[PDB]
Every structure is written in C-alpha cells, then in structure tokens.
Amino acid sequence: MIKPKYKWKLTKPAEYISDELTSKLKLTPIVKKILESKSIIDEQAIESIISDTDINHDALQLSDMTKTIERIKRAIANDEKILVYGDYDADGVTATTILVITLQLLGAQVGWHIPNRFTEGYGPNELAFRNAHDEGITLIITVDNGIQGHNEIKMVQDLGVDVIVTDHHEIGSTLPEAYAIVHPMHPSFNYPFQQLCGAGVAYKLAQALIENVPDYFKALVAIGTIADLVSLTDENRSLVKQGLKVLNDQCPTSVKALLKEAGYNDNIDEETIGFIIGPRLNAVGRLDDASLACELLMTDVEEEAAFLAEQVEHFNRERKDIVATITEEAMAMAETKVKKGDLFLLLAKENWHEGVLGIVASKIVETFALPTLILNIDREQNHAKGSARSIDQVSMFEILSAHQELIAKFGGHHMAAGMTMDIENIESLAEGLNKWMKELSKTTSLDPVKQVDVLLTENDITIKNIRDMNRLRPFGTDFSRPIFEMDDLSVSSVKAIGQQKNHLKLTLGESNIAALFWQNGHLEPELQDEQPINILGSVQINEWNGNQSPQIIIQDIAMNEQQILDYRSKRKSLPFTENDENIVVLIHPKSDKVNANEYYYGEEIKQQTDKVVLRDLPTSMEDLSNSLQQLQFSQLYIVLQHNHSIYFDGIPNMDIFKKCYKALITKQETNIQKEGMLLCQHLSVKPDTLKFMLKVFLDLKFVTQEDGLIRINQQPDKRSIDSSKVYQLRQQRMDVEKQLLYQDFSEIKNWIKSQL
Numbered sequence: 001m002i003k004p005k006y007k008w009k010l011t012k013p014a015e016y017i018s019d020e021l022t023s024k025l026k027l028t029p030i031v032k033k034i035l036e037s038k039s040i041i042d043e044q045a046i047e048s049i050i051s052d053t054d055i056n057h058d059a060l061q062l063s064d065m066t067k068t069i070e071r072i073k074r075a076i077a078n079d080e081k082i083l084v085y086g087d088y089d090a091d092g093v094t095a096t097t098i099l100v101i102t103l104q105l106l107g108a109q110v111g112w113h114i115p116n117r118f119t120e121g122y123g124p125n126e127l128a129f130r131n132a133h134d135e136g137i138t139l140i141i142t143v144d145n146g147i148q149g150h151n152e153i154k155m156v157q158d159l160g161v162d163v164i165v166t167d168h169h170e171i172g173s174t175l176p177e178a179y180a181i182v183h184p185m186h187p188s189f190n191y192p193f194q195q196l197c198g199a200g201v202a203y204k205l206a207q208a209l210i211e212n213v214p215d216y217f218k219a220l221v222a223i224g225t226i227a228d229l230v231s232l233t234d235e236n237r238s239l240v241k242q243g244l245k246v247l248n249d250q251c252p253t254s255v256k257a258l259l260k261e262a263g264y265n266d267n268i269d270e271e272t273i274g275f276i277i278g279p280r281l282n283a284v285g286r287l288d289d290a291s292l293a294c295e296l297l298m299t300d301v302e303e304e305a306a307f308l309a310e311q312v313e314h315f316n317r318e319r320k321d322i323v324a325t326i327t328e329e330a331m332a333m334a335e336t337k338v339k340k341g342d343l344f345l346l347l348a349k350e351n352w353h354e355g356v357l358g359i360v361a362s363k364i365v366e367t368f369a370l371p372t373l374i375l376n377i378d379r380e381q382n383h384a385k386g387s388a389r390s391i392d393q394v395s396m397f398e399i400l401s402a403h404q405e406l407i408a409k410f411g412g413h414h415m416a417a418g419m420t421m422d423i424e425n426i427e428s429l430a431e432g433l434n435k436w437m438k439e440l441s442k443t444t445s446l447d448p449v450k451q452v453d454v455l456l457t458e459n460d461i462t463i464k465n466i467r468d469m470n471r472l473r474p475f476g477t478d479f480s481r482p483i484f485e486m487d488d489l490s491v492s493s494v495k496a497i498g499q500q501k502n503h504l505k506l507t508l509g510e511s512n513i514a515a516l517f518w519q520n521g522h523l524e525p526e527l528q529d530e531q532p533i534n535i536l537g538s539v540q541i542n543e544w545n546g547n548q549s550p551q552i553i554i555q556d557i558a559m560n561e562q563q564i565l566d567y568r569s570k571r572k573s574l575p576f577t578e579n580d581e582n583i584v585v586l587i588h589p590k591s592d593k594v595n596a597n598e599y600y601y602g603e604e605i606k607q608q609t610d611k612v613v614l615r616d617l618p619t620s621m622e623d624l625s626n627s628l629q630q631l632q633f634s635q636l637y638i639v640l641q642h643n644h645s646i647y648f649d650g651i652p653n654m655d656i657f658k659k660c661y662k663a664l665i666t667k668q669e670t671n672i673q674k675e676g677m678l679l680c681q682h683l684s685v686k687p688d689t690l691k692f693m694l695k696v697f698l699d700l701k702f703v704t705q706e707d708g709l710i711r712i713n714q715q716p717d718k719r720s721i722d723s724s725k726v727y728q729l730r731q732q733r734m735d736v737e738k739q740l741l742y743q744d745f746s747e748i749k750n751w752i753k754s755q756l
C-alpha cells in the first residue's frame with residue numbers, strides 16, 4: 001500500500017455562497033468551492049477578488065515621503081550627482097530600473113550600483129559609499145536595502161553625502177541616521193498597505209515624483225512583488241493584475257527577449273513571473289553580479305536585449321547545474337544523518353557554491369521535512385558560510401540564538417537564515433540543534449502537513465470549470481494557490497515517463513482524467529494492479545495540437561483501502577515493536593505512558609497516524625470517536641487489552657441503591673466487614689457491586705468512610721439521582737464491552753466506518 005507523505009487537513013467550509021449570487025455572478029462549482037474554502041462569501045469580497053478597480057493610496061502618506069520628494073527635486077535642480085543603491089534580488093533589480101528611469105525622466109545625473117553577493121554582500125558597504133563620495137555623489141537613494149545600515153549611512157552622511165533609505169524588510173528597534181527613511185512598516189507613520197515590495201515602494205515614490213508612471217513600471221513591480229513573495233492582497237494584487245495585463249498586451253522589449261531564451265510564448269501569469277522570469281534574474285546575482293539583469297531591464301533595443309538575454313539564460317543554465325551537483329552530494333549526506341536519526345540536517349562540505357545554498361536547502365527540507373543548515377567549508381578563509389531553511393514547527397531564529405555561542409554571525413527569521421561560523425564548531429553545533437529538536441519532538445509534532453482547500457469530484461473537472469478558475473488569479477501569499485483532494489479514484493492507466501523513467505503518467509477514474517506525478521515514476525509497479533487511490537494536487541489545462549485537455553499535477557498520493565485487523569486476542573502477534581515510532585498506540589489512564597507512541601484517547605496525537613493500534617479498551621466510545629475522528633490511517637490494529645469484565649456483573653438497578661441507603665440510614669455508622677454479607681443479602685447483590693454503590697455514595701458525598709466504617713453526611717447536596725461520574729464510568733464501560741469486546745468484528749467495522 002502506498003503511504004501518504006503528508007498529513008492532510010481538509011477545510012470543511014462552514015459557510016456556503018448563496019445559490020442566487022452563484023447565479024448572479026456566474027460562479028461555476030470550482031471557483032465556488034475555492035472561494036468558500038477561503039470563506040469569501042459576501043458580494044463585496046467576491047467582487048473585490050473578481051473586480052479590477054485598482055487599489056491606490058496616496059504615496060504621500062508614506063514615511064518621510066514629502067521630505068524625500070523635495071530632496072530629490074533639489075538635487076536635479078542643482079545638477080547634483082545621484083546614485084541608486086540596490087540589491088541583487090529580483091525586487092531590487094526591478095526597483096532600481098523604476099527609480100533610475102524615473103530620475104532619467106526628471107533629467108537627473110543618476111547612476112546605479114548593485115552590491116556583489118560575495119565581494120560586498122547585502123546592504124550598504126563602507127567602500128562603495130566612500131567611493132561614491134570620491135565620485136562627487138551627493139545623494140544616495142537605496143532600494144530594497146538600508147533599513148539596517150546605520151553605521152555605513154552615518155559615516156557617509158558625516159562625509160556630506162545624504163542617504164534616502166527605501167526598503168520593506170523588517171525594521172529593527174533602531175532606525176538608521178539618514179535624511180529620510182521610506183518604509184511601509186515605519187513606526188512614526190501609518191500607510192494603508194504595509195506589505196509592499198521594494199519595487200512597490202519605488203512605484204509609489206515614482207507616482208509622487210511624476211504624476212503618471214510608465215506602464216512598464218507596473219509590470220516591473222509585478223515581477224518583484226511575486227518574487228519577494230509579499231502579500232498578494234490589497235495593493236499588490238491590483239498592480240499584479242495590471243502588471244500581468246501589461247506583460248500580455250504590451251510586452252516589454254526586455255522581458256520579451258528573456259522568454260524567447262526560455263522558449264516560452266504562452267499567456268503570462270503569476271507562475272511565469274514566479275518560476276520563469278523571477279528565477280532567471282536571481283541567477284545572475286547568485287553566480288555573477290545582477291547589473292546584467294538591471295541592464296536587461298533597462299534596455300529596450302531588441303538587438304542588445306537579445307544579446308543580454310543570452311548572457312542571463314547562460315547563468316540560468318549554470319545555476320541548474322551547480323544546484324544539481326551540490327544537491328546530489330547533499331542528498332547523499334542527508335540520507336545518512338536521517339538514517340542515524342538526526343532531526344536537524346546540518347550539512348557542511350567544501351567547494352559548495354554559496355550563491356545557490358539557500359536553494360539547495362529548500363530542496364532538502366522538502367525532501368525530508370526537517371530543518372536544514374547547508375554550509376560551505378572555505379578552508380582558504382577558515383569560515384563556514386551557508387544557508388538555512390526551516391519547517392513551520394521550528395523557528396530558525398530561536399534555535400540558532402539558543403546555540404549562538406558556537407556561531408560568529410547569523411541573520412534571518414523563523415523560516416530561513418544566513419550564517420558564518422568556524423569549521424571546528426560544526427560537529428559541536430549539529431549535536432546541539434539535534435538535542436533542541438529531539439526535545440521539541442515531544443512538546444511538538446514534526447510530521448509534514450498539507451492544507452487542502454477543496455474536495456473536488458470527477459464531475460467538476462471540466463475545461464470550462466478549470467479556466468474560470470483562471471478568474472480568481474493572481475494566486476500567492478495570503479491568497480495561496482488552491483490544493484484539491486480527489487478520493488476513490490481508479491488507476492486506469494499507469495506508465496513511467498522520462499529519460500530515466502522518474503516521472504509517472506496516470507489516467508484517473510472512469511472519466512479517465514490525465515494526471516502526472518513528477519519524480520515518482522518508481523511507484524508504477526505498485527499501481528499496476530487495479531487499485532483505488534486518493535490524490536492531492538492542482539488542476540491545469542494541457543494543450544496538444546490545438547486540443548485542450550484537463551490535467552492534474554499530483555503532489556501526494558494515498559491508497560483508499562482502510563484495513564481493520566482483529567488482534568483482540570493476539571496482542572503478542574502485532575507486526576511491529578511497541579517502540580516503532582511509525583505506529584501510534586492509543587491507551588487509557590490505567591496504564592502509564594512509557595513510549596511517545598503511547599498517546600491516551602481523546603488526546604490529540606499529531607504524529608502521522610497511518611498505522612494505529614487500539615491497545616487499551618476506550619474509557620468511552622466518544623473518547624475513541626475523538627481519537628478516531630482525527631485519524632488518517634491505512635491499517636487499524638484492534639488489540640483492546642482489558643484485565644476484567646462487567647458485561648454480566650451488571651449495574652445495580654436504582655431501586656437497589658435506595659435499598660442500600662435504607663440500611664445506611666438505619667444504623668448511621670456501619671462496618672462492611674461484619675455487615676457487608678447481610679447487607680449484600682437483603683439487596684440480593686454481590687460484594688463487588690456493593691463497593692460500586694458505596695463508591696458512588698462517597699462520590700455523591702451522601703456518605704463518608706474511614707477504615708471500613710461508613711458514616712452518613714445527613715442532608716447532602718442533591719447533586720443527582722445516583723448520576724455520579726463513577727456511575728457514568730460504569731455505564732460507558734458496559735457500553736464499550738457490548739460493542740467492542742463481546743460483539744462481532746463485522747459490526748465493529750461498520751461503526752468505525754461510521755466515524756471515519
């Protein structure tokens with residue numbers, strides 16, 4: 001049986017869209033299912049998402065905005081020399097182009113410099129700032145950098161060179177000493193949308209310096225806003241619909257040349273900006289510097305754009321190869337560590353190119369679902385510089401700050417970070433992170449999760465229904481791309497495609513829906529036999545010879561078969577060791593939790609629960625329901641260890657309880673050792689059941705006891721009619737014995753198939 005890699009959380013929309021609006025707004029079932037799983041139901045929201053009125057807030061409401069506008073205007077008037085300081089991100093290259101063109105249109109002596117990731121690193125560098133002063137630069141406008149360059153800015157500011165900081169990266173407790181700081185998230189000011197990218201901040205500064213901005217600027221903001229992965233809500237959303245509009249209607253010279261090098265000519269949307277255009281502009285600044293990418297974006301002559309688009313695409317080539325090699329070596333090292341049981345993948349080797357290390361780390365976290373540090377051992381500089389990527393259950397900042405004594409310089413956040421340390425401290429640091437992770441392994445679950453937006457049926461996979469979903473685009477952060485679940489799907493056709501037969505081609509269901517699972521062509525032999533499979537994935541339209549067809553890109557795959565096995569008398573024959581980790585053991589309080597697998601009923605196990613063993617008899621059917629209603633398994637093992645039974649002993653009727661109280665009221669104080677047998681006689685009950693009755697009377701505090709001597713509390717609180725917690729426990733215990741221990745497995749299966 002194929003095992004799911006993730007653990008699937010399907011959103012069950014509590015609210016649904018009116019069947020009137022569904023019709024008033026021509027909402028096909030797929031767009032309707034997506035909207036509802038984002039809970040966007042009211043007419044405003046739906047219109048907001050489908051509408052195109054642009055989102056535009058006075059850029060004058062930005063931090064130090066007017067203060068800045070005039071500082072730039074004056075420099076152009078006094079023939080001052082300008083320098084735009086930028087970054088090698090696609091946001092920084094797109095932001096530089098916008099500002100340089102804006103200043104060129106204002107007739108300014110503008111020049112630009114992008115720091116080298118290796119020779120200079122990110123942000124202001126003393127040498128460059130001094131060099132600019134030496135070149136007569138009087139004003140430096142930074143883009144996607146500066147908010148954390150206090151020292152460098154002050155030095156040059158004291159040299160007489162004003163610095164205007166424009167950034168969107170998290171601000172610190174201290175703001176650098178500079179003429180002006182334009183930041184959407186600045187303490188002293190409040191701007192409607194605070195999730196703008198560097199290009200977005202530049203667009204607003206431009207819209208303020210020049211009233212009407214060239215349309216190229218909108219496309220450039222779109223490229224950077226989708227690459228910096230900023231929130232795709234409010235403003236960012238409109239600029240992308242506009243910038244995606246521009247790239248199709250009036251495609252720029254610079255960008256055209258690029259996609260001609262990739263060989264891409266189909267309609268352009270956010271994924272093109274994500275997977276195709278974005279990653280090419282970064283390649284240059286990850287191997288060589290990105291001035292080329294800026295020069296490509298700045299050029300509108302087909303001849304040079306084409307010559308320059310060649311030099312970029314060459315770098316995209318090499319990044320694929322350099323990443324491919326580093327990963328081959330690192331995937332080999334990671335397999336050993338995880339096989340030895342590491343929980344933090346700290347991989348450190350030599351000749352590892354640093355410009356691609358963050359990339360290599362993302363492939364490692366996706367393949368292993370573990371937080372990873374990827375380091376290059378530079379023995380020519382006795383430093384280990386590298387990158388880190390995280391999982392949600394772990395903050396990369398915290399765990400490094402707790403181990404910061406072994407680290408020389410480390411900066412980043414919860415999901416990612418950059419570090420420089422000593423080659424001799426790596427082996428010491430790995431154990432520390434592993435210790436921190438193996439302690440969190442208790443308080444926290446580390447198994448990968450996937451959020452499922454919609455449960456789609458074969459009757460929704462229509463070309464019309466799938467393109468109408470191209471109406472909710474653009475998709476991205478804060479408006480994530482939908483993930484669909486499809487169950488009870490037959491594996492009609494199965495094939496292994498690719499030179500190395502690594503991709504899997506499949507036909508699904510009775511309607512034979514084409515599906516592809518990349519890098520999983522090794523599962524063909526298992527899916528050859530006709531078998532029903534549940535699937536998670538995205539829906540798109542593949543077009544061949546003018547014929548459009550629905551296609552599903554699978555992300556995860558599970559076998560629909562749910563197996564329930566009777567070991568109700570074969571406990572010692574379980575096919576696994578109690579300490580197997582992959583197996584979850586559902587137990588009840590009477591036993592002490594010895595292993596982490598042992599989780600009590602009702603308690604929320606969050607470890608992947610593909611193989612679940614019901615070791616102890618549930619205290620209640622609903623407690624099992626709770627511990628079952630959270631179950632995603634392929635094989636359930638029902639052992640149900642119990643030491644005694646109550647099925648035949650029975651619960652005394654309520655007429656007998658009063659006939660016990662009768663004896664108690666007659667003497668007030670009684671000793672059960674001498675009076676119990678006579679007591680049990682007139683009650684026509686047994687010794688064990690008398691304890692139960694006295695134990696409910698003591699629970700209801702109707703009586704008190706001391707060394708066998710039972711005493712009456714006279715008038716007690718009228719808590720209930722013998723409806724005590726102890727009385728209830730018995731009711732539930734007899735309930736579980738009748739349905740689970742002393743019933744037929746067939747009907748037990750027909751109940752476990754009722755819950756889940």
Ligand SMILES: [Mg+2]
Nearest residue numbers: 091144198228
């Ligand atoms: Mg940025």
